Every structure is written in C-alpha cells, then in structure tokens.
Amino acid sequence: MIKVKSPGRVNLIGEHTDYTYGYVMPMAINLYTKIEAEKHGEVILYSEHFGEERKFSLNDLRKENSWIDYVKGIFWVLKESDYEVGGIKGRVSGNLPLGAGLSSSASFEVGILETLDKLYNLKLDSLSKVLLAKKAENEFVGVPCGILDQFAVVFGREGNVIFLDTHTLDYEYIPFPKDVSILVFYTGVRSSEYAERKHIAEESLKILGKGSSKEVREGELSKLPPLHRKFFGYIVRENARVLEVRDALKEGNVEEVGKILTTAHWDLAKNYEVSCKELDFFVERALKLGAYGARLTGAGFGGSAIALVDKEDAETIGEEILREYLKRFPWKARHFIVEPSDGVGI
C-alpha cells in the first residue's frame, strides 16, 4: 500500500495567458487530494467525496461521464505512451474542495499518475508527469486547458511560487514572503466561455503571425478585429504584470505585488469579461479590510478568489467577508488560508 498527496493550486498572477504561451506564476497549495492504493487486477476506487466506489477493467477505457473518467484518462495516456501498468485498488480522499477552481482535476489526475508511477516503478520525470496529465485532460476527458494547473501541482516547492514561461517551459522558483497569507475565498459557484476565449486568442496569434503573446506589443493590436483586440489587450498587459510581480517579489515588495494583483483583477473583470459580482464583492471587501491586493484565480465566472493578507489577520478578514457575503448571496461560500507548498509526492 502507498499513500500519495497531490496538492491543488492557486495562480498568483498570469491569468488567461497560458493558452497563448505567455507567462504564469502559480503555486501548489496545502489542500490535497489523497490517494491510498495497492496493485490490483482491475481499477477499483472509493471516492470519499462522492461516497461511492467506481471501477473498471483495464480493458475498459470507455468514457462513462463521471469522475472515474479522470482515472481512465491517466490509464489511457499511459497506454498511448507505451507504458505497461496494471490495476489499482484504493481510496481517494483529502481536503481539496471539488470544483472550487483550485484544480481538483489536475490534483486528482496527477495524484493517480503518481500512484501508478510509484506502484509500477515507472520512474517518470516531473515534466513527463505534467505533459501526460495535460494530455489526459485535453484528449481523453476533453477539457481544453493550458499547462498552468498541471505544472503547479507537480513542480510546487514549499515557500515558493513558480515563475513559468509556458512557451519554453523554463521556470524559476521565487520565494513568497514570510507572514503573508493567501486567503482563498470560494464563491460557492462551481467552460463554454473559456473555450471561446481560448479560440479567439489562438486566432489572434495567427492574425498577428506570432507563436506566443510574449512577442506581442500594444501597438500591434490595431491589426486585430475589435473583440479579438479587446481580449488580447488584456493578455499583453497581463504578461507585463507577471514580470512586474516577479521583480517585486524578488525584492520582497509585497505592497507592490498586491497593487498589481488588484489592477489585474479589474482588467480581467472589465476587459476580459471573466469575473462576476460574487468575485468582485470579495475583492472589493478584502481591499477595504486591509489586503495588499486581491484577484480572482483560475478561469473566472465563479470559482475562487485570493487575497494577500498579513498572516495574523487572515482568519479575521476571511470570517468578516464570509459573514457579509452570506447575507448577500445564496451559495455555500468557504474560505481557506493556504501557503505555497510542495508538489505531488508520497
């Protein structure tokens, strides 16, 4: 029997940049999918979250349109890459909230991959784990996505964020300040919009004749159609913000990091049009209550937001905002205090 702990993730800055091969800056967080498993002739997994067992023969990688598909996708991608692995029997648990925008999918997929890696002695390198998990999500599960989530879940390092160039896959660890906490606020609001943004951005790159948004300047966007232009303007500003945050963090200037996050949030909300009143509420109140800055994290249109706050005030701020929020909105909102953590491991 082995135990794997696979973290979720938050993106600090660099939102809606990965699918144009821009810059991103995620961290793994200390909320986890836990998998405890042993070898078996078929695949049998009990999900604590769903309170149910689902199983399949190794012969059977047919999509079933349930959570088991995330498991099948890893078996599929391993088979497609010429690995021989056998079955597993085990239990999936942990404290990472499902569908909150903290990357339940990548956490789970990478966790299954790591379980198989260890049980079957596959000796996968870290980048292969990221690429296999991404390929499973994209091609088997059928969810478009960039590399952000998988990279964070694998490459996370305690006390550090990851600055990543998603075009080259060059990355560096940047220390995150002591006694600054990440307050995560899940709105209680659990894809077509994402696919549209991705499609428009990819088309814009072709119009511009460029392979990455890193290569694009404000000036060039006049060449794009009005809607392409609006959205791509955000992407260019966002890449610049990632580099600004990198410099500010390397100086320990959390006040500047916070300011940049806030600017980024309103850019997402007003120009990329991917926020909602629930996320905006959290951001505005967190700022009034003393956060250095705040921003939605992940795709938007629900999910979670983050606020950078003094460690000693994180609990009070989360509690005050949650009470206000629940008077205004019907959803089962939750807050968590997280820190930058190590990537997937036993």
Ligand X SMILES: OC[C@H]1O[C@H](O)[C@H](O)[C@@H](O)[C@H]1O
Residues near ligand X (CB under 6 A) are: 11, 15-16, 18-19, 145-146, 148-149, 298-299
The encoded tokens of residue 303 equal: 């999910």
Q: Could you list the residues known to form a binding site for Mg(2+), using ranges.
A: 105, 137
Q: How far is the CB of 296 from ligand X (least distance, A)?
A: 10
Report the residue number, 87 or 300, with the smaller CB distance to ligand X. 300
Q: Is 149 a catalytic residue?
A: yes
Contact 168/162 with Cβ under 8 angstroms? Answer: no
Report the residue number, 3 or 198, with the smaller CB distance to ligand X. 198
Report the residue number, 71 or 153, with the smaller CB distance to ligand X. 153
Q: How far is CA 332 from CA 98, 279, 280, 301, in A?
A: 13, 14, 17, 16
The encoded tokens of residue 304 equal: 């979670």
How far is 295 from 259, CA to CA, in rounded Å?
Answer: 10
Q: How far is the CB of 330 from ligand X (least distance, A)?
A: 25
Catalytic member of 149, 165, 170, 310: 149
Q: How far is the CB of 82 from ligand X (least distance, A)?
A: 27
CB neighbours of residue 54 within 10 Å: 18
How far is 192 from 71, CA to CA, in rounded Å?
Answer: 23
Name the residue among 295, 337, 333, 336 with its Cα closest to residue 188: 333
Q: How far is the CB of 298 from ligand X (least distance, A)?
A: 4
Q: Could you list the residues known to form a binding site for ATP, using ranges.
A: 47, 99-105
Q: Could you list the residues known to form a binding site, using ranges.
A: 15-18, 47, 99-105, 137, 194
What backbone phi and psi angles, to 5 degrees, belong to 183?
-85, 115
How far is 101 from 305, CA to CA, in rounded Å?
Answer: 9
Contact 25/161 with Cβ under 8 angstroms? Answer: yes
Report the residue number, 89 or 105, with the smaller CB distance to ligand X. 105
Active-site positions read 149
